[PDB]
Design a protein around this ligand. Structure first.
Ligand SMILES: *[B@@]1([O])O[C]([C]C([O])=O)C2=C1[C]=C(OC1=NC([N])=NS1)C([C])=C2[C]
Length: 360
């Protein structure tokens, strides 16, 4: 029967990668022809033997950037900001800084001029320290020219989008975005009542690792969610028209490409590829040099719709966790892979590619 064949396909993709990367627990969720399918493996906690289920909460790391982008899409639909705004329009503390000459689009798409991968260790999670970091920052190169993947960059984008809406980022996400998307198992700050679902993360010698506080952590990498809720978010991205109109438009804003770097087209949060494309090229787009090195961009003459024969994806990691999400708009196919070890992106993509190729 189809259930036997689908289980065989997903197990064949997952099981060797879990063994090879010593992953304690992993949850898969697939959306196929409008129907969800879940496959849960291993342990959420090795110490107490709690099993992974589709309700287990995992840290999704930088997949959070697609939620940040969705909030910004809502601010855009409301006309509270524009992507061409100067960043300092939305925060008087930045008036007269170099953010007078940097757009919100540049921040969102990592092209502001060399904002680093992470805030320096010297900037703690403190409003004044964050403010002062941005006030003094100077670009290494012209804005809009080079992509350097960056938490302070899209972090500031989310922070400013929240200011355009007159409310803190975390509050907007909890009170407005997650409810509008129908997400009740998605958190920036896990409730005490949901802690039993929060998987343990694992590092070297199985050191336990759950993400700690950092500057603009919520905007950059702070979401915890289940495979079932993250698949609900993928299904909202596959069918924005099913949501109330302002939220449909907010999702659509995350499906617009601005430039290319190699095979990858950069949207707000989402990164897109032509589909089909080889596994090696999809792995190279999600490689360590893409996360760590600047790359000159090839700007598109007009923003491009990220739909049809394309794969939209995002990797996300924390010290203890490794996530990957991908979907194919023109095929109504979605996939989520959440694990409680930060294992290589190439390996995440390997599982995903086997599944997506076999669903096709
Ligand atoms: B984010 O998860 O995207 C990458 C990793 C990947 O999977 O592509 C990334 C993200 C965040 C991040 O900074 C972090 N700081 C903390 N405290 N947790 S994650 C870094 C360094 C990278 C590479």
């Amino acid at each position: 029967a189809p259930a036997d064949r689908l289980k065989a396909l997903v197990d064949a993709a997952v099981q060797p990668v879990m063994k090879a990367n010593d992953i304690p627990g992993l949850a898969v969720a697939i959306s196929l022809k409008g129907e969800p399918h879940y496959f849960s493996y291993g342990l959420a906690s090795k110490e107490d033997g709690r099993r992974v289920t589709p309700e287990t909460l995992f840290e999704i790391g930088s997949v959070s950037k697609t939620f940040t982008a969705t909030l910004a899409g809502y601010a855009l639909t409301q006309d509270k900001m524009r992507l061409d705004d100067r960043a300092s329009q939305h925060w008087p503390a930045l008036q007269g800084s170099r953010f007078d000459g940097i757009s919100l689009l540049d921040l969102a798409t990592y092209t502001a001029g060399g904002l680093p991968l992470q805030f320096p260790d010297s900037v703690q999670k403190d409003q004044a320290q964050i403010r002062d970091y941005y006030r003094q920052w100077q670009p290494t190169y012209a804005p809009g020219s080079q992509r350097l993947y960056s938490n302070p960059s899209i972090g500031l984008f989310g922070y400013l989008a929240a200011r355009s809406l007159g409310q803190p980022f975390e509050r907007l996400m909890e009170q407005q975005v997650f409810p509008a998307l129908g997400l009740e198992q998605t958190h920036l700050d896990v409730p005490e009542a949901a802690l039993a679902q929060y998987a343990q993360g694992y590092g070297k010698d199985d050191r336990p690792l759950r993400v700690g506080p950092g500057p603009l952590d919520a905007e950059g990498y702070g979401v915890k969610t289940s495979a079932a809720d993250l698949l609900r978010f993928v299904d909202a991205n596959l069918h924005p028209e099913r949501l109330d109109r302002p939220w449909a438009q907010a999702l659509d804003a995350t499906h617009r490409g601005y430039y290319k770097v190699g095979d990858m087209t950069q949207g707000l949060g989402w990164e897109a590829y032509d589909w089909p494309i080889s596994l090696k090229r999809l792995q190279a787009g999600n490689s360590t040099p893409m996360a760590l090195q600047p790359h000159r961009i090839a700007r598109l003459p007009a923003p491009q719709a990220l739909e049809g024969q394309r794969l939209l994806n995002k990797t996300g990691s924390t010290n203890g966790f490794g996530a990957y999400v991908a979907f194919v708009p023109g095929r109504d196919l979605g996939l989520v892979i959440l694990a409680n070890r930060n294992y290589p992106n190439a390996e995440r993509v390997k599982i995903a590619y086997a599944i997506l190729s076999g669903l096709e």
